[PDB]
Ligand binder design. Structure first.
Ligand SMILES: *[C@@H]1O[C@H](CO[C@@H]2O[C@@H](C)[C@@H](O)[C@@H](O)[C@@H]2O)[C@@H](O[C@@H]2O[C@H](CO)[C@@H](O)[C@H](O)[C@H]2NC(C)=O)[C@H](O)[C@H]1NC(C)=O
Ligand SMILES: *[C@@H]1O[C@H](CO[C@@H]2O[C@@H](C)[C@@H](O)[C@@H](O)[C@@H]2O)[C@@H](O[C@@H]2O[C@H](CO)[C@@H](O)[C@H](O)[C@H]2NC(C)=O)[C@H](O)[C@H]1NC(C)=O
Lengths: 45, 45
């Protein structure tokens, strides 16, 4: 998402191929959610 | 990290210097981590 920009849906462009776009913020958010889950497990379980 | 882009390692450029590149996202993430650690520590005690 840093070297790409979004403009509309993908029903207009002719020849648009369709592949995963990586988002670092979501990756670190998921990692921190996993860390919080581990902390909660250490708290109760 | 917003001012600059990363390309390669430090063993190729002639004249590369020794300096910290500040990451605001990592700074706020570490602040959140410290806050959550203190929260859990005072919750346990
Ligand atoms: C490109 O995506 C199209 C659009 O489908 C969407 O994206 C897919 C990756 C998947 O998550 C779908 O559920 C999404 O709706 C894909 O075309 C789909 O093809 C499947 C298999 O026949 C069909 O069930 C869906 O209905 C199609 N989607 C639509 C909107 O008609 C296409 O497969 C993707 N390209 C590649 C190379 O996988
Ligand atoms: C630029 O710094 C690197 C590494 O950072 C230094 O060491 C850390 C442990 C920490 O104390 C930092 O603040 C320091 O700035 C230096 O790379 C080292 O170079 C030596 C000599 O060639 C080599 O033996 C080490 O393996 C290197 N270490 C790494 C991690 O690459 C580098 O030399 C510094 N630049 C200059 C001109 O001295």
């Amino acid at each position: 998402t840093d070297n790409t920009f979004v403009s509309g849906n993908c029903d207009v462009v002719i020849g648009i191929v369709n592949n995963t776009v990586y988002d670092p913020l979501q990756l670190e958010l998921d990692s921190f959610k996993e860390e919080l889950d581990k902390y909660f497990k250490n708290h109760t379980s």
